[PDB]
Amino acid sequence: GSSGSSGMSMLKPSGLKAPTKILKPGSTALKTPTAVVAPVEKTISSEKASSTPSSETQEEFVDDFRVGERVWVNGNKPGFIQFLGETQFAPGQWAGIVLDEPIGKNDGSVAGVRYFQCEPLKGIFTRPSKLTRKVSGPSSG
C-alpha cells in the first residue's frame, strides 16, 4: 500500500499540436496520383488463401490484465483496456475498456472522475475476470 503515484502526472504528449476543432476538408477531384496496396492475390488456378499457422491459446490462471490489449467483455465485446485498478465510486478492481461499437454505457468517467478518455457508449467499467481473449463458446455452430 505504498507504490502509488511518482513525480507529477504523466507528461507524455502525442506529437501534432495545433487543431482545436472538427472538420473534413476535401471537395476537389483528383489531387495526387497516390496508389494503394493489394492485400489480395492472383487466383486463376483454383485454390484461395493459405490457412495453416494456428494458435493454441492456453487458459492458465487468468487473474490479471494489461493496458493496451484487446479483450472480449462477457466473452462477446472486443475492446481495448485503458484503465486497470480501483475506482473512486465502488471498492474493488475494475477495468475501463473501449468497445468498438455504440453498445456501451459509460464514457470512461464516474462522478466527473476521468479514468480513461474514450468515445461515448463504449467506455464500460467491468471486472477483468469477466474479460476473455478472442471470441469463443460452445461447440454447436
Q: How far apart are alpha carbons 141 and 135 in whole angstroms?
A: 13
Which of 5, 117, 16, 27 lies closest to 67 in space, CA to CA?
117
Which residues form the domain of 110?
63-141
Beta strands (DSSP E) in the chain are: 70-73, 78-86, 93-99, 109-110, 113-114, 123-126, 131-132
Q: Count other C-beta atoms under 10 Å from residue 19's C-beta.
A: 7
Q: 138: which 3 cell numbers?
A: 460452445
Contact present, 110 and 88 (Cβ < 8 Å):
yes
Q: How many CB atoms lie within 10 A of CB 107?
A: 16
CB 122 within 8 A of CB 104: yes
Q: Are 107 and 113 in contact (CB under 8 A)?
A: no
Q: What is the CATH number of the domain that holds 93?
A: 2.30.30.190
Cα separation of 68 and 83, whole Å? Answer: 9
